Amino acid sequence: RLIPATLYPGRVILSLDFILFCLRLMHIFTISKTLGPKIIIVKRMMKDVFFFLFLLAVWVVSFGVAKQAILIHNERRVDWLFRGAVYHSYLTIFGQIPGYIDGFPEWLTVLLLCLYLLFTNILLLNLLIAMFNYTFQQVQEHTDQIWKFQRHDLIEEYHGRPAAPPPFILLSHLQLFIKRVVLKTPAKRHKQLKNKLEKNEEAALLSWEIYLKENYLQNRQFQQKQRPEQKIED
Amino acid sequence: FHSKLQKVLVEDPERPACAPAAPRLQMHHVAQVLRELLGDFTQPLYPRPRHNDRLRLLLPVPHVKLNVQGVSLRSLYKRSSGHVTFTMDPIRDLLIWAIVQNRRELAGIIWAQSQDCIAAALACSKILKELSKEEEDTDSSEEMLALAEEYEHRAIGVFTECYRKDEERAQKLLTRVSEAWGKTTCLQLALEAKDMKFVSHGGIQAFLTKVWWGQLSVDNGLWRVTLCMLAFPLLLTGLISFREKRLQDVGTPAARARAFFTAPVVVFHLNILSYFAFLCLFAYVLMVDFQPVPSWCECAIYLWLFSLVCEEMRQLFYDPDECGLMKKAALYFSDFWNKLDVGAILLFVAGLTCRLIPATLYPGRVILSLDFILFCLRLMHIFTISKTLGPKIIIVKRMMKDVFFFLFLLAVWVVSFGVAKQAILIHNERRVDWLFRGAVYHSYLTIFGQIPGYIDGFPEWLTVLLLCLYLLFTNILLLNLLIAMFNYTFQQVQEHTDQIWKFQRHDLIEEYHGRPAAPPPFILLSHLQLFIKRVVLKTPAKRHKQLKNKLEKNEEAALLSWEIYLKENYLQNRQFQQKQRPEQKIED
Amino acid sequence: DPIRDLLIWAIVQNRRELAGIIWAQSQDCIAAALACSKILKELSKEEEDTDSSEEMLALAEEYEHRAIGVFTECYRKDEERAQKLLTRV
């Protein structure tokens, strides 16, 4: 961007950053109760994204090479023969089909288009649905507990931090340095979830906790006897 | 088994085959029938040759001086042989005799005192499974199959107990040969018994994924090994995790790369990349190099076809029977993927005849395009490798015939709409072999998006009505119910498919291990390396590069004692669980 | 922490039956159960013997459930003090 002789490469190398930062935005957006535990599913599928990309894109090339073979295409320019040969194959999958150019071998054009679409839109779509759904069911409890788990990681970083907006956070960045201009040791404050308790109240909570432990132990001992396998042994 | 034994005695009767006589049963006959029940493995448990050829002792055959189809080393000929002391597997002899009679309660007691434990259990499973498929009585066949699966679980338990403690010696025990069971190995013996559950258990696939990835590691990534695949200098860098690097045994970069290349994984990737690039090479000679003459970039295809087809004769000469040339090709014929490979070869033969003839270039431009996808099917056949790919490509293996089924369903249903679409509207676009276009080819395009609305649309209400009705029938019923019948079948046999993929994992490993690490471009050199060798040599005794490890006796004894100890440990645990089961305590 | 001293010594030796008896007389209950779970989980990942590692992991999960039960019994009655007990050092 600073070099004036490479603006065009700077117009194409900084566009990917817009989605690379969108990935980071999605990383922060593991928050909602109906969002996070099912974004753990895409966390499970992060490598399978590359896997299915390598599968489906190669299978798409398998049709793109075959599409332009029999028909006599003549549209070619520097870095646009590539367009007319390959770029027009992925568009014919999601709808941009130049039929007046794509269609003697009309029977074979029908046959191959039906066969490749049968292989893709059936097998790689609905079996993909099945292998998504079964994996979703398999570790749904695991993912729920995992999201419950990482809930605290966001809380820890968002609690021990000043409430200043990011535009003003540069002020708080220098607030800790002007403080250390006078101070010399790291003893400013402990703003963590670590609460020290007075002894006269700690004793009161601990006695209550012991009482409830014994209550729980009696209940567990009762359930162990109530279990029918124990009575068979009896 | 008694019927089979009374039938072998007549197939080799007294006069013509066991020439002196054979109305008496003797151990050679039962060895012969056990060989039939087992696979094509080595000489059976009892002595075949002239020393103890037990076929022809009822007539006064000569004594020790004979040593041909008679008694040679044994003491006396008293209408018997003598004391063949214990034939080195006395417990296994009772185990086989009890197994062939389907005495379930009796065989379990005898197997407890066995020596070569896992091998005996697997061999019994194979014999039972083979006898069940031939038993005419359904009750006997079902009981035999159930006992075979019981002995499967019995073997799996012992191997699990052995693998938990010192898995490194567990794999050694796995790959060890067994003199007491026909000079075979436990792993190989599992393949023929077909053994869904044993081969899918833990350490089995661990040893598979250890022999695969030959010497490097099991930890570093597939996406990271491919970088040093292409970048030769990057291999010597501190990026890959070797075992030679772990042991700092790198005294020669040539040897460090030699082990890397002899690892089966890079051979697989190198073959895959050659097959991927020669497809691009074939695509090169159809867009720009459409010439009626063999050009500069054309003889490479003929040489490549010559190189690839030689792998078939290499496989034929790999491990055949020394008498059956046609009986080995039956396996290749039954292999429908091999049938597709040879069909793709035949289609190339049919297309080359049109390519060489200058008067049929246009038919050669349309008959060789299908080969590009026919070879893509073969590429997909080889791409049953990844852990998230193979066990769910077993689903499309299940659905291979249903692909044709749903094609015949949906295409006919598409024609049902294509015929009706052009009926009411007055279409007038027609040319030779383009009236077909304008009538039928424009119907499938209107399904996936190419709808010429300005031509397709008085009967606008009926055009709306029929388009809504047909699309309701297709995109709802044949789509989401298809989803349901895919998902339910995926759930139904998911475990079956997982174990099946675990099963076929070894088939790739066997073909990719016993093969030189040369790239396919250089494999023509190794093709003639075995012929220049046979110019000097005369007998097939070059080497045995199989997963069959012979063991020294002083170490075999050490493993077998440990295996017996662990068998007894496992038996005590199983006996304890049987008592712990509540149904047993109710009986108590 | 005399009871906690026996609890740690019994936990590190994988004496499942012995540690449960000692934990019943413990004072800082949930903290002790969680600490025992962490020690067992850390020792399992380093134990070379697979049987010992599996038993240690199973005991760690057992002590997990033991802590969860006590905390549930504490949270049912006066959840406001239950969180105070949770966040106490």
Side-chain angles (χ1 to χ4, degrees):
Chain A
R1 189 254 187 269
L2 63 91
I3 290 181
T6 177
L7 268 180
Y8 266 80
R11 202 205 159 113
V12 310
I13 207 166
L14 280 151
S15 285
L16 190 143
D17 221 340
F18 208 82
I19 321 294
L20 171 60
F21 273 121
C22 202
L23 263 71
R24 209 199 167 261
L25 171 67
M26 295 298 102
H27 167 44
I28 318 295
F29 281 165
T30 76
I31 192 66
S32 174
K33 302 154 288 306
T34 62
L35 175 144
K38 282 164 293 307
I39 282 179
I40 309 301
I41 312 299
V42 303
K43 291 302 170 288
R44 288 282 187 268
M45 295 296 172
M46 181 215 78
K47 295 283 300 178
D48 310 316
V49 168
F50 300 101
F51 159 71
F52 194 70
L53 176 62
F54 195 88
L55 179 47
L56 188 54
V58 173
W59 192 239
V60 162
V61 180
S62 178
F63 165 67
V65 183
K67 184 178 72 168
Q68 297 293 322
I70 290 176
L71 59 92
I72 304 172
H73 68 91
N74 304 315
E75 189 269 334
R76 67 178 183 181
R77 298 185 189 97
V78 171
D79 277 333
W80 277 287
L81 164 68
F82 182 79
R83 173 173 186 267
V86 188
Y87 164 74
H88 281 109
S89 48
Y90 191 76
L91 273 295
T92 51
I93 304 185
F94 282 93
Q96 182 61 258
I97 304 171
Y100 294 153
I101 314 299
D102 284 333
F104 179 68
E106 309 291 326
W107 61 273
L108 195 150
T109 309
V110 170
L111 173 65
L112 177 70
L113 187 62
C114 292
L115 275 161
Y116 178 75
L117 285 189
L118 160 68
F119 285 122
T120 60
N121 287 125
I122 309 301
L123 278 301
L124 297 155
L125 177 63
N126 313 306
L127 280 69
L128 186 79
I129 293 173
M131 61 79 71
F132 285 160
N133 302 9
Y134 191 90
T135 55
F136 176 81
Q137 290 167 355
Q138 178 56 65
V139 291
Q140 181 162 0
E141 311 182 341
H142 287 292
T143 59
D144 193 298
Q145 295 164 354
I146 281 167
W147 176 76
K148 297 309 199 45
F149 190 179
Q150 282 106 6
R151 267 199 52 170
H152 186 273
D153 291 331
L154 283 72
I155 302 299
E156 186 74 22
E157 81 205 90
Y158 268 115
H159 169 263
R161 173 203 286 195
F168 293 156
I169 212 66
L170 304 101
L171 280 76
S172 50
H173 280 129
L174 181 57
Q175 281 169 357
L176 279 74
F177 296 155
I178 186 171
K179 201 199 298 180
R180 290 207 178 281
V181 173
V182 170
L183 278 174
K184 56 196 179 320
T185 77
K188 58 181 80 68
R189 203 48 189 82
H190 290 294
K191 310 158 191 169
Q192 206 176 2
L193 286 198
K194 197 192 318 300
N195 201 353
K196 193 88 170 309
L197 271 297
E198 195 263 313
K199 60 191 307 311
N200 270 324
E201 155 179 46
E202 179 147 19
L205 282 72
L206 267 68
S207 85
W208 175 57
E209 183 178 1
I210 303 302
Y211 176 62
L212 268 61
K213 162 187 67 160
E214 313 173 350
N215 188 344
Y216 154 75
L217 284 174
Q218 281 185 7
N219 273 333
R220 184 151 162 241
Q221 184 178 2
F222 189 72
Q223 312 314 82
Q224 186 43 245
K225 271 167 211 175
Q226 285 321 293
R227 276 148 39 73
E229 311 86 300
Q230 175 70 30
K231 287 197 179 58
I232 303 184
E233 307 288 353
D234 182 349
Chain B
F1 192 80
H2 176 249
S3 176
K4 295 190 62 50
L5 260 181
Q6 296 295 321
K7 156 154 190 295
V8 63
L9 274 191
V10 184
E11 300 165 271
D12 291 331
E14 57 269 15
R15 298 306 154 248
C18 311
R24 74 181 331 151
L25 176 145
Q26 199 172 40
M27 302 285 328
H28 187 274
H29 305 265
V30 71
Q32 191 177 325
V33 70
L34 290 175
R35 182 176 176 83
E36 161 159 332
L37 294 174
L38 293 183
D40 289 15
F41 303 157
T42 61
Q43 189 274 330
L45 294 90
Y46 313 118
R48 207 271 175 200
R50 63 211 187 280
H51 280 249
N52 258 329
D53 180 41
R54 307 296 94 179
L55 300 179
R56 305 159 176 106
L57 318 178
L58 188 136
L59 264 64
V61 293
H63 48 95
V64 177
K65 204 75 178 47
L66 166 73
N67 75 67
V68 182
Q69 53 94 34
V71 292
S72 60
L73 195 144
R74 304 306 176 269
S75 66
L76 275 298
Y77 179 50
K78 44 179 91 156
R79 287 309 185 276
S80 299
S81 182
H83 192 202
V84 181
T85 81
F86 290 99
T87 187
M88 62 85 58
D89 57 278
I91 320 292
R92 277 78 76 198
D93 300 305
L94 279 186
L95 189 60
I96 301 175
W97 168 88
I99 284 299
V100 294
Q101 290 176 340
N102 202 6
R103 320 203 182 276
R104 171 173 172 292
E105 271 298 3
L106 182 59
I109 297 169
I110 304 191
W111 179 89
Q113 272 87 10
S114 179
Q115 195 210 50
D116 202 339
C117 277
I118 298 170
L122 294 176
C124 293
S125 67
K126 194 201 156 42
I127 299 168
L128 283 196
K129 259 194 201 164
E130 184 63 29
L131 272 180
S132 169
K133 284 189 290 189
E134 180 174 12
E135 178 48 275
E136 52 279 359
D137 195 25
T138 181
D139 291 331
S140 299
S141 88
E142 269 176 24
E143 295 193 279
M144 281 205 208
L145 193 58
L147 191 49
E149 292 174 356
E150 159 175 334
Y151 264 117
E152 200 86 339
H153 281 57
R154 205 190 290 269
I156 297 169
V158 165
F159 181 73
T160 311
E161 191 81 359
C162 203
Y163 175 76
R164 282 167 87 81
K165 293 184 38 59
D166 206 350
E167 65 183 1
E168 191 58 350
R169 287 169 69 224
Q171 290 97 22
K172 298 172 57 57
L173 187 153
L174 179 150
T175 191
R176 180 203 50 101
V177 305
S178 296
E179 204 201 346
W181 280 105
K183 294 215 165 53
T184 62
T185 61
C186 295
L187 174 60
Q188 185 197 356
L189 194 56
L191 277 296
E192 281 86 330
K194 188 85 169 181
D195 291 331
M196 295 298 103
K197 275 160 280 312
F198 175 73
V199 70
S200 298
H201 186 273
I204 301 299
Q205 305 279 325
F207 172 76
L208 291 193
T209 318
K210 180 67 174 66
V211 60
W212 169 271
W213 289 55
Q215 316 86 337
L216 323 182
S217 67
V218 309
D219 175 52
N220 52 21
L222 73 165
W223 67 274
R224 209 162 74 189
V225 59
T226 60
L227 302 187
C228 63
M229 183 177 176
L230 283 193
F232 174 100
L234 269 62
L235 176 66
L236 277 296
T237 59
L239 187 148
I240 201 154
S241 46
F242 283 159
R243 189 203 31 87
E244 282 283 275
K245 204 196 173 181
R246 164 68 198 89
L247 294 174
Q248 66 175 102
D249 292 336
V250 184
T252 299
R256 189 185 155 188
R258 184 41 91 211
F260 178 71
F261 285 125
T262 56
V265 189
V266 298
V267 176
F268 169 75
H269 295 105
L270 183 63
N271 185 273
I272 285 305
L273 271 192
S274 67
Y275 192 85
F276 195 86
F278 277 97
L279 296 181
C280 182
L281 192 74
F282 181 54
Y284 186 93
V285 288
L286 63 88
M287 294 182 286
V288 180
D289 213 1
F290 201 83
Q291 314 305 315
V293 74
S295 316
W296 182 259
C297 196
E298 175 75 28
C299 197
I301 296 89
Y302 312 133
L303 208 47
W304 178 253
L305 185 135
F306 172 62
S307 83
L308 297 193
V309 71
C310 284
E311 299 298 326
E312 184 40 58
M313 52 155 48
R314 200 262 304 161
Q315 216 188 354
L316 188 146
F317 190 71
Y318 200 74
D319 213 340
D321 285 331
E322 279 316 301
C323 204
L325 197 78
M326 185 40 213
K327 303 182 287 182
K328 189 202 193 284
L331 195 144
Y332 300 101
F333 274 133
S334 88
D335 291 331
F336 61 95
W337 284 112
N338 277 339
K339 273 210 165 195
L340 287 172
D341 188 293
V342 294
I345 295 310
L346 302 182
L347 190 153
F348 193 85
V349 181
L352 192 55
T353 47
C354 315
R355 189 254 187 269
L356 63 91
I357 290 181
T360 177
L361 268 180
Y362 266 80
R365 202 205 159 113
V366 310
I367 207 166
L368 280 151
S369 285
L370 190 143
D371 221 340
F372 208 82
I373 321 294
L374 171 60
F375 273 121
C376 202
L377 264 71
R378 209 199 167 261
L379 171 67
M380 295 298 102
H381 167 44
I382 318 295
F383 281 165
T384 76
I385 192 66
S386 174
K387 302 154 288 306
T388 62
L389 175 144
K392 282 164 293 307
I393 282 179
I394 309 301
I395 312 299
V396 303
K397 291 302 170 288
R398 288 282 187 268
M399 295 296 172
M400 181 215 78
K401 295 283 300 178
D402 310 316
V403 168
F404 300 101
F405 159 71
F406 194 70
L407 176 62
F408 195 88
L409 179 47
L410 188 54
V412 173
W413 192 239
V414 162
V415 180
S416 178
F417 165 67
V419 183
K421 184 178 72 168
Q422 298 293 322
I424 290 176
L425 58 92
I426 304 172
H427 68 92
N428 304 315
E429 189 269 334
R430 67 178 183 181
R431 298 185 189 97
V432 171
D433 277 333
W434 277 287
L435 164 68
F436 182 79
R437 173 173 186 267
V440 188
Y441 164 74
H442 281 109
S443 48
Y444 191 76
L445 273 295
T446 51
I447 304 185
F448 282 93
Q450 182 61 258
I451 304 171
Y454 294 153
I455 314 299
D456 284 333
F458 179 68
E460 309 291 326
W461 61 273
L462 195 150
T463 309
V464 170
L465 173 65
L466 177 70
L467 187 62
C468 292
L469 275 161
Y470 178 75
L471 285 189
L472 160 68
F473 285 122
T474 61
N475 287 125
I476 309 301
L477 278 301
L478 297 155
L479 177 63
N480 313 305
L481 280 69
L482 186 79
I483 293 173
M485 61 79 71
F486 285 160
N487 302 9
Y488 191 90
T489 55
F490 176 81
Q491 290 167 355
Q492 178 56 65
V493 291
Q494 181 162 0
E495 311 182 341
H496 287 292
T497 59
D498 193 298
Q499 295 164 354
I500 281 167
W501 176 76
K502 297 309 199 45
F503 190 179
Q504 282 106 6
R505 267 199 52 170
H506 186 273
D507 291 331
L508 283 72
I509 302 299
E510 186 74 22
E511 81 205 90
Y512 268 115
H513 169 263
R515 173 203 286 195
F522 293 156
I523 212 66
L524 303 101
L525 280 76
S526 50
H527 280 129
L528 181 57
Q529 281 169 357
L530 279 74
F531 296 155
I532 186 171
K533 201 198 298 180
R534 290 207 178 281
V535 173
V536 170
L537 278 174
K538 56 196 179 320
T539 77
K542 58 180 80 68
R543 203 48 189 82
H544 290 294
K545 310 158 191 169
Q546 206 176 2
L547 286 198
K548 197 192 318 300
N549 201 353
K550 193 88 170 309
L551 271 297
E552 195 263 313
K553 60 191 307 311
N554 270 324
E555 155 179 46
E556 179 147 19
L559 282 72
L560 267 68
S561 85
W562 175 57
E563 183 178 1
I564 303 302
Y565 176 62
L566 268 61
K567 162 187 67 160
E568 313 173 350
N569 188 344
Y570 154 75
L571 284 174
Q572 281 185 8
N573 273 333
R574 184 151 162 241
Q575 184 178 2
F576 189 72
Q577 312 314 81
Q578 186 43 245
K579 271 167 211 175
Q580 285 321 293
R581 276 148 39 73
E583 311 86 300
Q584 175 70 30
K585 287 197 179 58
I586 304 184
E587 307 288 353
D588 182 349
Chain C
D1 57 278
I3 320 292
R4 277 78 76 198
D5 300 305
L6 279 186
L7 189 60
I8 301 175
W9 168 88
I11 284 299
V12 294
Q13 290 176 340
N14 202 6
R15 320 203 181 276
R16 171 173 172 292
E17 271 298 3
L18 182 59
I21 297 169
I22 304 191
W23 179 89
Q25 272 88 9
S26 179
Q27 195 210 50
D28 202 339
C29 277
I30 298 170
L34 294 177
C36 293
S37 67
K38 194 201 156 42
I39 299 168
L40 283 196
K41 259 194 201 164
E42 184 63 29
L43 272 180
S44 169
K45 284 189 290 189
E46 180 174 12
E47 178 48 275
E48 52 279 0
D49 195 25
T50 181
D51 291 331
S52 300
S53 88
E54 269 176 24
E55 295 193 279
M56 281 205 208
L57 193 58
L59 191 49
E61 292 174 356
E62 159 175 334
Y63 264 117
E64 200 86 339
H65 281 57
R66 205 190 290 269
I68 297 169
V70 165
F71 181 73
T72 311
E73 191 81 359
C74 203
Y75 175 76
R76 282 167 87 81
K77 293 184 38 59
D78 206 351
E79 65 183 1
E80 191 58 350
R81 287 169 69 224
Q83 290 97 22
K84 298 172 56 57
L85 187 153
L86 179 150
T87 191
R88 180 203 50 101
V89 305

